[PDB]
């Protein structure tokens, strides 16, 4: 499909501009803030690589009567934790709390990946595992991580809240897409499925980064 490839290109391109943009803004940054710029460049860069790889025809593996794009999940497993890290730096979390939110994040990504890789109905069981871990992650986001961020300057306090809403609201859509897309009910075509994910991936990553750069000043 030529349509799947262009959607992948659009993604790689959109991520590229995000990266270059963040790497530029990150250029010349204090020895106590570069961490943000550099993590933002990783979130964007990794995704860009993953998209170009898929655009090029790599990772399109068949499972049952569908095809699963492995580079998407590899990306997710590597990038979502960085997003949570970033959010964590804002909130002012320590190793303890960081550690908790990160693993909870990894379980849902690992479970989603495993789930999409199995042909049998037990895939729903794997999906269900990620579902419960995600509600947990969201709990920590709007809960303890929030109260924890309420101790920063009015500036940081407001940036975190905008980013967590953006995050929580958009991420909650992914599972439903998975459920309706080919991995589950396949009530959604691969192409629409991919178009939707590309958009979400872009906003929750590059959209995320730009909102942060705006705040930087
Ligand atoms: C840059 C990529 C991002 C922000 C990807 C986010 C993906 C999710 C929030 C996926 C969530 C899922 C569940 C909550 C249930 C298990 C199945 C998944 C992996 C689709
Ligand atoms: C890309 C967004 C970076 C935001 C960095 C906020 C750093 C706040 O740093 C703050 C004071 O000094 C320090 O507590």
Swiss-Prot record:
Keywords: Cell membrane, Chromophore, Membrane, Photoreceptor protein, Receptor, Retinal protein, Sensory transduction, Transmembrane, Transmembrane helix
Membrane-side (Extracellular) residue stretches: 1-3, 56-69, 118-121, 182-189
GO MF, any single term: photoreceptor activity
Membrane recorded as keyword: yes
Keyword hit for Transmembrane: yes
Residues on Cytoplasmic side: 26-33, 92-94, 150-153
Gene Ontology biological process terms, A to Z: phototransduction
Listed name of the protein: Sensory rhodopsin-2
Organism expressing this protein natively: Natronomonas pharaonis (Natronobacterium pharaonis)
């Amino acid at each position: 499909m030529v349509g799947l490839t262009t959607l992948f290109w659009l993604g790689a391109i959109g991520m590229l501009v995000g990266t270059l943009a963040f790497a530029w803004a990150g250029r010349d940054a204090g020895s106590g803030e570069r961490r943000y710029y550099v993590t933002l460049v990783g979130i964007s860069g990794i995704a860009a690589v993953a998209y170009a790889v898929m655009a090029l025809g790599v990772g399109w593996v068949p499972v049952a009567e569908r095809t699963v794009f492995v580079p998407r999940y590899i990306d997710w497993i590597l990038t979502t934790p960085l997003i949570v890290y970033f959010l964590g730096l804002l909130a002012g979390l320590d190793s303890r709390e960081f550690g908790i939110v990160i693993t909870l994040n990894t379980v849902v990504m690992l479970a989603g990946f495993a789930g999409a890789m199995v042909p049998g109905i037990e895939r729903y069981a794997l999906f269900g595992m990620g579902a419960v871990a995600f509600i947990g992650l969201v709990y920590y986001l709007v809960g303890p991580m929030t109260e924890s961020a309420s101790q920063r300057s009015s500036g940081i306090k407001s940036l975190y809240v905008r980013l967590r809403n953006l995050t929580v609201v958009l991420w909650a859509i992914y599972p439903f897409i998975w459920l309706l897309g080919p991995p589950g009910v396949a009530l959604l075509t691969p192409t629409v499925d991919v178009a939707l994910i590309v958009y979400l991936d872009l906003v929750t990553k590059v959209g995320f980064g730009f909102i942060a750069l705006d705040a930087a000043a």
